[PDB]
Amino acid sequence: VSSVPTKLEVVAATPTSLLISWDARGEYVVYYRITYGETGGNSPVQEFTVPGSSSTATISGLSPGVDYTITVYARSYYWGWYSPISINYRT
Amino acid sequence: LDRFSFSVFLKEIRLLTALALPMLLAQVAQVGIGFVDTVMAGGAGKEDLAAVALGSSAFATVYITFMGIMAALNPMIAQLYGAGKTGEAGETGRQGIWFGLILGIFGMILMWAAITPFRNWLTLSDYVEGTMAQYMLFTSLAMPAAMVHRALHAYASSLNRPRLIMLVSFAAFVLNVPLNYIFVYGKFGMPALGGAGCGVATMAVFWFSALALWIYIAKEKFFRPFGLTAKFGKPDWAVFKQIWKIGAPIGLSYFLEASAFSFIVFLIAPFGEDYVAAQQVGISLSGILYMIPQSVGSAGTVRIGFSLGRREFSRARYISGVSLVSGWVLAVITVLSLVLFRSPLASMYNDDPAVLSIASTVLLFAGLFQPADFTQCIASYALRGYKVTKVPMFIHAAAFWGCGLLPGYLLAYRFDMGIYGFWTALIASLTIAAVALVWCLEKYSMELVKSHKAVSSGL
Numbered sequence: 001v002s003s004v005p006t007k008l009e010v011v012a013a014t015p016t017s018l019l020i021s022w023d024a025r026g027e028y029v030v031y032y033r034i035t036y037g038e039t040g041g042n043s044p045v046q047e048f049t050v051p052g053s054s055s056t057a058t059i060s061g062l063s064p065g066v067d068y069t070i071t072v073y074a075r076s077y078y079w080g081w082y083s084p085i086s087i088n089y090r091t
Numbered sequence: 092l093d094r095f096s097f098s099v100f101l102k103e104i105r106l107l108t109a110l111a112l113p114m115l116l117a118q119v120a121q122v123g124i125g126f127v128d129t130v131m132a133g134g135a136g137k138e139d140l141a142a143v144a145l146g147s148s149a150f151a152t153v154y155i156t157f158m159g160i161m162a163a164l165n166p167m168i169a170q171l172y173g174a175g176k177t178g179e180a181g182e183t184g185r186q187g188i189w190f191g192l193i194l195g196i197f198g199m200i201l202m203w204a205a206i207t208p209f210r211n212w213l214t215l216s217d218y219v220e221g222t223m224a225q226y227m228l229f230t231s232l233a234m235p236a237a238m239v240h241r242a243l244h245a246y247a248s249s250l251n252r253p254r255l256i257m258l259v260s261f262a263a264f265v266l267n268v269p270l271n272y273i274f275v276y277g278k279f280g281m282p283a284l285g286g287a288g289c290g291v292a293t294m295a296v297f298w299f300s301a302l303a304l305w306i307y308i309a310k311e312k313f314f315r316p317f318g319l320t321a322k323f324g325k326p327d328w329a330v331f332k333q334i335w336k337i338g339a340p341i342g343l344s345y346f347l348e349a350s351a352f353s354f355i356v357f358l359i360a361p362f363g364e365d366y367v368a369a370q371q372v373g374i375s376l377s378g379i380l381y382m383i384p385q386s387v388g389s390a391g392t393v394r395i396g397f398s399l400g401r402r403e404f405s406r407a408r409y410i411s412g413v414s415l416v417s418g419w420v421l422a423v424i425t426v427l428s429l430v431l432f433r434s435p436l437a438s439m440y441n442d443d444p445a446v447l448s449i450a451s452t453v454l455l456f457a458g459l460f461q462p463a464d465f466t467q468c469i470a471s472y473a474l475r476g477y478k479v480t481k482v483p484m485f486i487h488a489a490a491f492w493g494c495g496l497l498p499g500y501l502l503a504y505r506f507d508m509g510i511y512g513f514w515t516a517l518i519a520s521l522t523i524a525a526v527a528l529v530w531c532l533e534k535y536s537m538e539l540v541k542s543h544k545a546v547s548s549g550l
């Protein structure tokens with residue numbers, strides 16, 4: 001019974017890839033899975049997966065200018081998911 | 092083609108609460124240094140042929156010029172107090188302290204080189220020579236530049252809530268007056284050489300304050316990682332090489348006032364002897380109180396680059412404004428006491444003996460450039476100050492001289508009593524700062540939209 005890993009930030013790309021540096025005050029039990037996709041609806045969703053206070057990582061942004069939407073995920077106490085939080089801001 | 096300077100007005104919500112108020116004591120400890128000088132201009136007049144400043148103002152060139160490079164870490168170590176390890180911040184602090192001690196040994200070798208004002212082409216006050224115990228204020232007070240650089244690299248790590256330097260570099264001058272005169276002629280001390288000995292005194296006091304660095308790993312958690320200040324990592328290990336291109340672009344851009352040097356002292360050089368060499372009584376009273384001015388943003392350069400690591404993007408560069416226009420209050424509400432007042436009977440014969448019997452064609456420019464400049468670098472001490480913005484904020488000033496060139500021989504070639512008349516495109520070279528600078532500070536507070544790439548979050 002909670003809310004999300006609550007910050008949003010993508011500062012800069014590497015015009016190919018992108019740094020994502022969001023909130024994580026500790027962990028909980030331990031965890032991030034982070035969505036990976038455009039907002040197009042096509043080009044399937046994919047997965048970065050990370051540890052500690054580290055939702056503060058960075059993608060591999062293969063393709064070019066196109067709008068990419070990208071969520072993150074907590075995991076907790078219950079081996080299930082605390083909340084998700086998403087932004088979409090592309091290249 | 093009307094305002095390519097985007098949204099200039101806006102740097103505002105309810106910011107009245109912007110407190111860079113300890114960022115004044117940063118430059119009141121600096122009047123604490125500013126003010127020894129006179130305690131040995133008028134402390135070493137005991138020797139009359141010791142107008143001695145004849146060195147200690149062409150020493151203080153390869154100070155304030157290198158001094159630049161070093162004060163270029165002002166951001167570095169604020170911007171990584173958005174992070175956490177002032178020991179990684181510190182491993183710079185050290186890498187630099189290696190600089191401010193390494194470039195301090197060029198200060199201290201380019202100084203060795205220095206000593207041949209055995210040279211000539213123009214007039215007195217600036218050529219003659221015969222008895223030179225400057226000879227010695229050279230070496231004796233040039234032999235410091237190392238420890239005197241580390242002893243700045245100190246406050247190049249006071250860029251994060253301490254001004255324990257208003258503490259020392261006050262009771263550092265107080266250490267010096269006493270000392271100063273012992274060497275000019277004194278007690279049990281080496282009590283002979285005085286036309287220098289004011290200065291061997293002076294510099295002893297740089298190595299004194301040099302370690303109120305050491306002696307302030309003391310009030311709280313460290314800034315001491317003085318493990319071997321070593322480098323090697325690539326061809327040349329940066330965090331040092333990285334300091335380079337915040338360095339070059341500053342001293343070489345502190346070579347602004349480094350030519351407002353051979354401009355200000357080359358128009359006493361024609362038949363304008365008398366009250367055009369009393370120009371420098373005003374333009375010394377320029378620097379004397381232009382300092383608590385100017386250097387507020389050369390203190391506010393913290394509050395901004397510090398709050399970039401701490402990712403409050405423009406939630407600091409829109410205090411760039413409410414710091415810009417805050418001393419900008421007094422930038423003009425004391426250009427009033429500059430075009431107005433003069434050297435009265437409150438002026439005696441101090442910093443340069445010339446008070447009674449000369450004109451006020453001297454407060455004519457105590458307004459021209461005075462406020463139209465005031466802030467127009469406490470812009471840049473918040474450009475570089477903020478970002479890396481000195482890369483061609485170096486070429487900020489290739490125009491503050493290459494645009495104030497002909498307004499050099501345009502007091503000469505004149506239409507009126509143009510004593511402030513080569514202060515023409517040298518208050519217009521200097522008011523095109525109104526632009527490129529605070530241009531890149533809305534090219535630039537408009538870059539922390541790009542970098543604030545997620546407008547807010549949830550709950």
Ligand SMILES: CC[n+]1c(-c2ccccc2)c2cc(N)ccc2c2ccc(N)cc21
Pocket residue numbers: 128132142144145148149216352375378442443
């Ligand atoms: C001692 C006067 N004074 C000052 C000075 C020192 C402190 C405050 C204001 C001016 C000076 C300051 C700078 N930067 C550069 C050159 C000179 C200089 C040069 C020659 C001279 N004969 C006196 C000079």
